[PDB]
Amino acid sequence: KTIIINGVQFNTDEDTTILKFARDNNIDISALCFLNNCNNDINKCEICTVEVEGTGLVTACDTLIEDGMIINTNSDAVNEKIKSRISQLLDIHEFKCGPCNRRENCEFLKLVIKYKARASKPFLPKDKTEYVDERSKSLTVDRTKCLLCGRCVNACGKNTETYAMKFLNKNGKTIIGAEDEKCFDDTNCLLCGQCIIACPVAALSEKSHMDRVKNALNAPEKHVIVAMAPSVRASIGELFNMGFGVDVTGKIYTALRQLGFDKIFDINFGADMTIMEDATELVQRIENNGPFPMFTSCCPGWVRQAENYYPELLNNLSSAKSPQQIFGTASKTYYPSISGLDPKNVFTVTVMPCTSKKFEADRPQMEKDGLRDIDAVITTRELAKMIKDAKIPFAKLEDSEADPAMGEYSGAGAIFGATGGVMEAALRSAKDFAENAELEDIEYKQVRGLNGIKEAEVEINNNKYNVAVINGASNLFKFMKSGMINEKQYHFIEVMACHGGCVNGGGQPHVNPKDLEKVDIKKVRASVLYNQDEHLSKRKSHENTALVKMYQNYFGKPGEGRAHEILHFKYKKSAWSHPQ
Ligand code: 402
Ligand code: SF4
Ligand code: SF4
Ligand code: SF4
Ligand code: SF4
Ligand code: FES
Ligand SMILES: [Mg+2]
Ligand SMILES: [Mg+2]
Numbered sequence: 001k002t003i004i005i006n007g008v009q010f011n012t013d014e015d016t017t018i019l020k021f022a023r024d025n026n027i028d029i030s031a032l033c034f035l036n037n038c039n040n041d042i043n044k045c046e047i048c049t050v051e052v053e054g055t056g057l058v059t060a061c062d063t064l065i066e067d068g069m070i071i072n073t074n075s076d077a078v079n080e081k082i083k084s085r086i087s088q089l090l091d092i093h094e095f096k097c098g099p100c101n102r103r104e105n106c107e108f109l110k111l112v113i114k115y116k117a118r119a120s121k122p123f124l125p126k127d128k129t130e131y132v133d134e135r136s137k138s139l140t141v142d143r144t145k146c147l148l149c150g151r152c153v154n155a156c157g158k159n160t161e162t163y164a165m166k167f168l169n170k171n172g173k174t175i176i177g178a179e180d181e182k183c184f185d186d187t188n189c190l191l192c193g194q195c196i197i198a199c200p201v202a203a204l205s206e207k208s209h210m211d212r213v214k215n216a217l218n219a220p221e222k223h224v225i226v227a228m229a230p231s232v233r234a235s236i237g238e239l240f241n242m243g244f245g246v247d248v249t250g251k252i253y254t255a256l257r258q259l260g261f262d263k264i265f266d267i268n269f270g271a272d273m274t275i276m277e278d279a280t281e282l283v284q285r286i287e288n289n290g291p292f293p294m295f296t297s298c299c300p301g302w303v304r305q306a307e308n309y310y311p312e313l314l315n316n317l318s319s320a321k322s323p324q325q326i327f328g329t330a331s332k333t334y335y336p337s338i339s340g341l342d343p344k345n346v347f348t349v350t351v352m353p354c355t356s357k358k359f360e361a362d363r364p365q366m367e368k369d370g371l372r373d374i375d376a377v378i379t380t381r382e383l384a385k386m387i388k389d390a391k392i393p394f395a396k397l398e399d400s401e402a403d404p405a406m407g408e409y410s411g412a413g414a415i416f417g418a419t420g421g422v423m424e425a426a427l428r429s430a431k432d433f434a435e436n437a438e439l440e441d442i443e444y445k446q447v448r449g450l451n452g453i454k455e456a457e458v459e460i461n462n463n464k465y466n467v468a469v470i471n472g473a474s475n476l477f478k479f480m481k482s483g484m485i486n487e488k489q490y491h492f493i494e495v496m497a498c499h500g501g502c503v504n505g506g507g508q509p510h511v512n513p514k515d516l517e518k519v520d521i522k523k524v525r526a527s528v529l530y531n532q533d534e535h536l537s538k539r540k541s542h543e544n545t546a547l548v549k550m551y552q553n554y555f556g557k558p559g560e561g562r563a564h565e566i567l568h569f570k571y572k573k574s575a576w577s578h579p580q
Pocket of ligand 8: 217218219224260
């Protein structure tokens with residue numbers, strides 16, 4: 001068929017939208033509510049407006065190309081309409097970018113500047129309390145910034161299929177929010193933060209723990225430990241104009257030291273701990289030929305999904321604490337034992353790519369003798385904001401190392417941040433354990449990648465076992481509802497709530513749709529972790545020298561005794577009750 005766009009003739013066979021065809025051919029068309037191959041069907045934003053001869057103004061984002069179409073994307077009428085839409089949005093938008101947390105990477109401000117739009121009447125509510133919801137331990141809503149674009153709703157539907165984010169009718173006005181406008185924590189919401197990642201403005205954000213960290217740092221008697229998740233070192237550079245896929249581990253260590261933290265550890269050490277415990281548990285279930293299957297329990301989003309939809313599986317989840325919580329528990333017990341610090345004066349902070357980790361850290365029972373395992377969790381974005389507010393020249397910093405007592409990590413722990421990393425590491429350790437060997441073939445590429453559901457057969461002690469990696473909460477729903485769990489006997493199943501793994505976490509740096517279309521952020525971010533694992537000498541969790549010392553001199557045998565007593569956390573279904 002033949003297409004004419006801005007006077008240029010194309011002869012094509014594709015069956016696609018005007019927007020996608022124009023972007024494939026370097027023709028600029030604006031867009032806002034279109035994301036994840038979906039737009040806001042009920043109140044289209046119409047910023048992708050184009051003129052089609054014989055039809056009039058159409059939305060390029062959901063209008064398929066067809067033979068004989070003559071399109072104009074830059075006429076005075078088209079730009080007039082788009083600017084009118086942006087002005088109408090500003091009419092409901094508190095346009096005060098100074099203190100806004102999306103000041104530096106906001107799609108809406110970009111469009112406003114592009115079209116020189118201005119509100120017909122400035123939106124200036126002087127009682128913001130009715131527009132804000134800070135009840136959640138993980139999420140926060142600021143509806144003075146909400147464009148009602150629907151990208152959060154669509155993203156929740158696609159990534160989790162829970163539809164916990166919904167359009168609501170509050171006092172005859174349309175808002176976005178949780179079921180019955182409740183606190184997200186009190187619903188089936190997973191707190192995964194994918195809605196945040198899909199928001200083009202500062203309407204949805206993470207629950208800030210920055211004041212916690214500041215107060216702890218400024219308290220004279222507090223010894224503030226900091227430890228970052230695997231994915232942080234593969235991601236934060238994006239917010240300092242360093243590009244995608246840049247390993248900035250040493251820069252992060254140096255920046256953390258410059259921010260005043262008293263000890264620089266690493267959550268990958270806790271990942272090696274979790275692998276110790278989980279591989280021991282798996283080898284035991286194997287030698288006992290049950291119980292099966294065993295689910296990972298390190299992803300709090302998947303933990304909430306199980307609690308809210310599949311309580312019958314809670315008993316099959318590993319009792320090992322997640323890397324964050326296991327690290328914190330050890331930080332309040334073993335670390336004082338090798339340092340002399342009063343355990344009550346230790347304040348443990350984690351840097352996570354995740355908003356659900358905030359909920360996990362504040363679980364009432366995630367403490368001991370009155371000491372929280374983890375006292376504060378800040379997202380990648382939060383750490384970036386802290387670094388910039390301190391005017392630390394991150395991109396120019398020299399590399400430093402972490403304190404090794406709880407900062408060393410193997411490649412097994414290094415790849416935790418990618419989908420299938422936990423399973424690969426656990427297999428690396430479990431095969432050696434069960435066969436009492438030091439096997440050299442350790443790479444399990446079969447469980448890697450962005451496939452939603454990845455199954456594999458593995459040979460351990462010359463018996464065959466079936467493992468599955470569930471990559472995304474929606475894929476968990478598909479795996480369960482489909483009956484796939486019953487096609488064969490599964491023995492060890494990894495589950496991540498965020499497709500691609502923690503590298504695509506809800507607390508990660510925002511990426512504009514164009515950059516997303518030109519870069520596979522999931523793959524490029526996981527590339528850093530897999531390279532680290534490639535170039536590490538210790539690639540099995542149980543080879544971590546610092547962790548081996550910790551277990552030999554303090555915790556003892558993993559999976560039992562003091563180790564099980566302190567480093568484990570068993571989820572349990574709620575007892576039968578009536579009514580509900
Ligand atoms: N706790 C923990 Fe994990 C580890 O180590 C992070 O820190 Fe993850 C990441 N990156 C996050 O958020 S959680 C689930 N297991 C995979 S990786
Ligand atoms: S959301 Fe964007 S346009 Fe609105 S105040 Fe924040 S930076 Fe400015
Ligand atoms: S919260 Fe963000 S993504 Fe959701 S409707 Fe409002 S502006 Fe759009
Ligand atoms: S946190 Fe996750 S489950 Fe909850 S509304 Fe947002 S995307 Fe949906
Ligand atoms: S996959 Fe990682 S970032 Fe996403 S909810 Fe689970 S732990 Fe958090
Ligand atoms: S981008 Fe097409 S209607 Fe919003
Ligand atoms: Mg549509
Ligand atoms: Mg201090």
